[PDB]
């Protein structure tokens, strides 16, 4: 469908993931 919405959905989550890897990088 050529008429599908060509945008970025301005309601996407704008915050930082609080469950991102908080450890150190052992490698």
């Amino acid at each position, epitope marked *: *469908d*050529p*008429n*599908a*919405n*060509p*945008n*970025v959905d*301005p309601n996407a989550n704008p915050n930082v993931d609080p469950n991102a890897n908080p450890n150190a990088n052992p490698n």
Partner: antibody
Amino acid sequence: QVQLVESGGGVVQPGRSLRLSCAASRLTFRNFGMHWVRQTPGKGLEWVAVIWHDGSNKFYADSVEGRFTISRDNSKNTLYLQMNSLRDEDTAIYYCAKDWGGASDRVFDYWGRGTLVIVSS
Amino acid sequence: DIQMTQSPSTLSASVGDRVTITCRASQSVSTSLAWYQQKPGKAPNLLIYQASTLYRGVPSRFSGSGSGTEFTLTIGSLQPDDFATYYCQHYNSYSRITFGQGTRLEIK
């Protein structure tokens, strides 16, 4: 206040390629899908193509399949559409467009000034 | 594609009059209709979207109506600056964007 200036027009022979640009100003270009609308000298309006916000999907009108390609460069705040296998019935004033951004409304709000392309010999 | 026919091709009128410009679709497009007015030397501008909703910054004197294949623009009081070429453009799903021919509104 968000203006689209097209460039790259002139006069071309049939069968030769040509590059057009739609460098925009003060528009949040990365978030908006853009369109090309073609206005023939017979005051007819034909939609050309659409490129999504990042170029993931591109759609073309039936009249320009396999001949016109449209590319979007969010980094340089500009749009490109290159024509191949050009011929007479593309003699028109080329208009840029910016899709409004509605959920299901495919309409254009901020049109460009337009850049003229002539196919002749 | 969906052919888009609008009538009349030309309709002359005077200042202060009330005019309708209609546009007919070859097949049902629900309410996915848009309208543009093109002043000579300028790009067409948006007036109506969704075939009934007024775009931002458009004076209230313009009004649209219709569903399916029959649609109409109604201008309550024609103004001297409302004199231009008007297009009807649809964006129905699973179809490519097409335009009308363009009604010309001429003084007197």
